[PDB]
Write a protein that binds this ligand. Structure first.
Ligand SMILES: [Cl-]
Ligand SMILES: [K+]
Ligand SMILES: [Mg+2]
Ligand SMILES: [Mg+2]
Lengths: 102, 106, 108, 105
């Protein structure tokens, strides 16, 4: 029952990926397309990419989400849902994207 | 259907409070999720009929919230419940966030 | 083809106000939701420009659990009427203290 | 296999942006006519290539935001772009709310 969660918080950009069936080959493709590597950590198993020097405005956030969706679509992961919040105290926004296999 | 069968899972943090609503939700599916999420139980309340679990002691950071959502979605997928939509808000006054997950049969 | 129209249902709390937009929404569907949502009964009223139906639940406050129940009953009721849930989003307004959720539906 | 599309709407005042590598100008012009009608031009900018409309100097209330979303979704569906997901946030300091709609062929 393979699902994937991608979470993106801004700014600066921090992208997390969770899903037991996620391949390192897929992580590498997103590394290359999100225009600086994803580092793996266990418990829970996940990939993290932080771009500490970068600032993404609203349009660039839209662009990051498209590259993630498109990259994952080519690798057999289908977008099923998204949600987002903003934290007034930190000034950060966090978006989650949820994917499933076909 | 009576009301064609859908499910709503809502999760508020922190501390974690998980609620599960849906006419066709069986107690056996609630018991499977009880095991995956973590020895805390869902309690049943009526009107609206639903199951509530509170992890009074626990604190979930963003990564662990993502993990909770993923475990809920994967456990429900195996039970025949497909994720259709999600939404979320944060309350600045309380510092709590609430995410809702909507599921339908396959 | 064009294809079929879409539906947007929005709900703001509190107090609970439900609005429904969509050219192809039939009165029979509104009437079914009138009966399902509260569970003198409250009604949807029609207003033009933009054309929509509006219901307020009678001065209530709906806790987070009751908000989940309203959304489920809307989705379930519309699914039986041939409207399929495609997307949802929500925001909270810190200054009014109100939260708004949108549900978007397409024909099957 | 195909590029996806993101339409973002921020209020107020209402500003609509469209981002998608495969978006045709006829689609943009169709929305250009449908949006003010449901409630002036989309202008092209680079880096990344996108389309931007300042729909009005007048403020949209919640009902008119609903109506903008619906007219966008309906117009894009007729052009072969299917709604897959949405998300939204509100910024308390700026007082602006931003909604993103994601579409696929
Ligand atoms: Cl959302
Ligand atoms: K969806
Ligand atoms: Mg959503
Ligand atoms: Mg939100």
């Amino acid at each position: 029952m393979p699902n994937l969660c991608v979470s993106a918080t801004f700014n600066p950009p921090v992208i997390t990926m969770l899903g037991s069936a996620l391949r390192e080959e897929t992580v590498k493709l997103l590394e290359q397309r999100i225009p600086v590597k994803f580092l793996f950590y266990p418990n829970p198993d996940h990939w993290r990419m932080e771009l500490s020097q970068h600032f993404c405005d609203d349009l660039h956030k839209s662009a990051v989400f498209l590259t993630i969706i498109e990259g994952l679509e080519g690798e057999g992961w289908n977008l099923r849902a998204s949600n987002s919040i903003r934290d007034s105290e930190s000034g950060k926004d966090t978006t989650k994207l949820f994917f499933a296999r076909r």
